[PDB]
Amino acid sequence: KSRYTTEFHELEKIGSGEFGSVFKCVKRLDGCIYAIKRSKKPLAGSVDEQNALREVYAHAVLGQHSHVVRYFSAWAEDDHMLIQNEYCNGGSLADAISENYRIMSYFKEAELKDLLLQVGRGLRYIHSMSLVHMDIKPSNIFISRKVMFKIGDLGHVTRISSPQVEEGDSRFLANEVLQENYTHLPKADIFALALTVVCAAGAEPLPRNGDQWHEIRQGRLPRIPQVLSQEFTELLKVMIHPDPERRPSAMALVKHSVLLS
Ligand SMILES: C=CCn1c(=O)c2cnc(Nc3ccc(N4CCN(C)CC4)cc3)nc2n1-c1cccc([C@@H](C)O)n1
Ligand SMILES: [Cl-]
Incomplete structure (x- = not known):
């Protein structure tokens, strides 16, 4: 009934x-x-x-929006x-990454740039409505199949101004958010997206805390297994810059030359 x-x-x-x-x-x-x-x-x-x-x-x-579930x-x-x-119908990015790791496929340089752009467009939209997602990670990116990536799982979404901050997954969490600095939350979504692309690119499981966790928030990218161009690498590095104001906005992200393609 x-x-x-x-x-x-x-x-x-x-x-x-x-x-x-x-x-x-x-x-x-x-x-x-x-x-x-x-x-x-x-x-x-x-x-x-x-x-x-x-x-x-x-x-x-x-x-x-076409990049939001x-x-x-x-x-x-x-x-x-x-x-x-x-x-x-393509499940989550997390699933796809597991599956690549199983049948040994991989996300190419090109496909990594496509992921970044598409999720970037989704973020650009959320941010322009004065919201932030605050839990960007593979398990919250969904795939429709020739491929669309869509942001889902909006349970951490909060306002840019007067944010009710439930901290996202510690693996993807920017230091300034852990430090209770919520004056540039959009840039925390940017940090998280970069680490999300790094996962897709084949990195080892991200650190949840300890030394390796801190090393990343110092601006150091986790080790990759494949050949990324110096310029795409630099773009990912600056997205995890210790200074969140040095990170690109979503709007600057989707207009970046490395992604225009
Ligand atoms: C409605 C709730 C959130 N949500 C969506 O908005 C949404 C949209 N599309 C899809 N597509 C989708 C997901 C998983 C699969 N798989 C089938 C095959 N197996 C082997 C692996 C899983 C296939 C298709 N799933 C979605 N949601 C969902 C599903 C699961 C877990 C979670 C979060 C809580 O972690 N969210
Ligand atoms: Cl900002």
Whole structure:
């Protein structure tokens, strides 16, 4: 007797974690496929609730963009919350990276620049609406297949001004954010995107803390396994510059000559 059951037919579980479950579903009325997240309703006044609120109100603000996972609807039923999003048939960037690492394929220089540009366009859009994503990483980039990358998982999204900062994944987190400096949050999304491209390029698992973590925030790129041009390398280096004002904005990113291609 539920809306979920009523409007959708559930095809396959495509994700699970502390966030709950995600299902590939067909909507009966239109025959389209959607990714529907089903989670227990968070305790009131909890982090989980704060997180869930950041996401509903990001949708309220953002609307539709070709490099952001489209949001269609959200509701609550039983003791659960449901979020209906666009289904990206290529899964997440994280999955693709695992898969490259398995059948030994790889993301080429060219394809790495394409990833950077496309996610950059998504960020440029979010930033222009005075928001920041604050959890950019492979598992939150989705792929549609000839290939579109789309930013999803908006649960950390916050305002540039008066930001409610739930810190993202420590692996991708810029030092100034850890230092409780929120005067240039957009540049933290930039830092994270650079490390996201480095992952796609085949780097070893990023450090969660300790010496190697600090070395990166000193502006040093993790070791790669392949041949990146000096100029693409420099672009990635400056995106993880200790000084966030030295990092390009999303708008300067997508107009950069190395990416024009
Ligand atoms: C709705 C919620 C968020 N979300 C989207 O907005 C969204 C859009 N497209 C897709 N496409 C998609 C994802 C995974 C697969 N795989 C099927 C094959 N197996 C082997 C690996 C997984 C296939 C297709 N998935 C999405 N969401 C989703 C799925 C899972 C986990 C998470 C986060 C919580 O980590 N998010
Ligand atoms: Cl800024």
